[PDB]
Homo-oligomer: A and B are copies of this chain.
Amino acid sequence: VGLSYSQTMLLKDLMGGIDPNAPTWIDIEGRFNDPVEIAIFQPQNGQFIHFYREPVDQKQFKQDSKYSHGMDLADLFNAQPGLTSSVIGALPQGMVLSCQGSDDIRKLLDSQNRKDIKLIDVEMTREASREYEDKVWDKYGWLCKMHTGIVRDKKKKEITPHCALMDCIIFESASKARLPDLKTVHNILPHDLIFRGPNVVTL
């Protein structure tokens, strides 16, 4: 379906937690046209938005699963449709978003008619990536148990998967030379908005 009216009213309220002037990270898995996991993280307060999307192109998903995110199609069948378009639509106006590699994000933001949003492509050395990847996945990896597959590189070497939320925390760590010390870190989105149990139908 899409987001229902009440779901959209809730979303409006939850997005009230997002500080529009706060420095903010964004990362996705999948392509701008077919993203399967979105994460928006505000390090200052530790608030983040994190959800999933079932892929349209099943073949590419499987390949993107074996070589980057390692996700499973079965875990995505219940993701609430409309979330990507509604969270990107609900983002405040003129928000400055930080990312790693602006190319994929800009295309998605543009295809959702959100050109008002400026992007900060932050550069990150592979050395700095290797440093915090393991530290982040240990302190904060309980937030996403969705990467249950083996990801290998061109050289068939098994590698740590990418998580978008974990990628955001890694990015913040590298940009700050300090893994963030955050007491409270939480998703503004409830589990019943991210996933779909009962059925609602639009007209």
Bound Cα distance from A62 to B103, whole angstroms:
13
Q: Which residue of B lies closest to A62 (CB)?
A: B56
Q: Which residues of A, 88-128, contact B by the 8 Å Cβ criterion?
A: 88-90, 103, 107, 111-113
What is the size, in residues, of chain A's interface with B at 8 Å between Cβ atoms?
52
Q: Mark A62-97, 1 if CB is under 8 A from B, else 0.
A: 100000000011100100011011101110000000
Q: Is A111 touching B5 in the complex (CB atoms < 8 A)?
A: no
Cβ of A29 to closest chain B Cβ, rounded Å: 14
Stretch at the interface among A7-15, A154-162, A171-179: A7-15
Known: A47-B184, A203-B112. A190 touches B143 (CB 8 A): yes
Q: Which residue of B lies closest to A192 (CB)?
A: B145
Known: A17-B183, A143-B190, A203-B35. A74 touches B60 (CB 8 A): yes
Instruction: Report how many copies the assembly holds.
Output: 8
Q: Is A203 touching B5 in the complex (CB atoms < 8 A)?
A: no
Bound Cα distance from A107 to B59, whole angstroms:
11
Q: Which residue of B lies closest to A91 (CB)?
A: B5
Bound Cα distance from A175 to B122, whole angstroms:
47
Q: Which residue of B lies closest to A138 (CB)?
A: B93
Inside 8 A of A190's CB, which chain B residues have their CB?
Answer: 142-143
Inside 8 A of A72's CB, which chain B residues have their CB?
Answer: 58-59
Q: Is A56 touching B84 in the complex (CB atoms < 8 A)?
A: no
Q: Is B8 touching A5 in the complex (CB atoms < 8 A)?
A: yes
Q: Is B2 touching A202 in the complex (CB atoms < 8 A)?
A: yes
Known: A74-B58, A143-B190. A203 touches B8 (CB 8 A): no
Inside 8 A of A6's CB, which chain B residues have their CB?
Answer: 89
